[PDB]
Amino acid sequence: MTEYKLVVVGAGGVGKSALTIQLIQNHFVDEYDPTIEDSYRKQVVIDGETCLLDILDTAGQEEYSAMRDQYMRTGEGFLCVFAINNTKSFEDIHHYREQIKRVKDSEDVPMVLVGNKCDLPSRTVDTKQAQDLARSYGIPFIETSAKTRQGVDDAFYTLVREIRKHKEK
Ligand SMILES: Nc1nc2c(ncn2[C@@H]2O[C@H](COP(=O)(O)OP(=O)(O)O)[C@@H](O)[C@H]2O)c(=O)[nH]1
Ligand SMILES: [Mg+2]
């Protein structure tokens, strides 16, 4: 077993908690306090190898920004989540990509771009815009719904594969 630190980032309300709780507890939680930051463990086998995932469901500002920097430094891979009906949340991805690279002082940081809430109407962020951005970063892009579970396992397990690829470089 190897333990991997995964960090779920994105604007408030994009579905970080709903995605994480789906993976951990296998249900859609409608209401989970937006101000709670917590971490969860889950063991899974990926490509024949047993992994312990230590997943941080972030909630934004910290008491001290030094704490944010620390979880970015210890985080091995990042799920960068936006909501497909919230253009601002998508534009914020530029900032997350920049910031994480800055804190880690690295050009090569495992990440997956996640466009969540794909079951909702009135999309404002086109799939193509997001695929273009992910391509520009060299990272995977997956659309998800924490409600239906579309893409949820794929997103987390793809991130583990990205972390492994980075480590085996
Ligand atoms: N319909 C739908 N609602 C979602 C989805 N993901 C999150 N939500 C809702 O969006 C709101 C914000 O979700 P939450 O997980 O608290 O977002 P966070 O602030 O990023 O942790 C909540 O009302 C959730 O019920 C999704 O994929 N589909
Ligand atoms: Mg939350």
UniProtKB/Swiss-Prot annotation:
Reactions catalysed, as given in the entry:
GTP + H2O = GDP + phosphate + H(+)
Q: Which residues carry this modification: N6-acetyllysine?
A: K104
Gene Ontology MF term list: G protein activity; GDP binding; GMP binding; GTP binding; GTPase activity; identical protein binding; LRR domain binding; protein-containing complex binding
Parts forming coiled coils:
none
The glycosylation sites annotated in the UniProt record are: T35
Ribosomal protein as UniProt keyword: no
Q: Where is this motif: Effector region?
A: 32-40
Q: Altering G12S: what's the impact?
A: In GASC and JMML; also found in lung carcinoma; somatic mutation
Q: What is the effect of changing K117N?
A: In colorectal cancer samples; somatic mutation
Q: What is the name listed in the Swiss-Prot or TrEMBL entry for this protein?
A: GTPase KRas
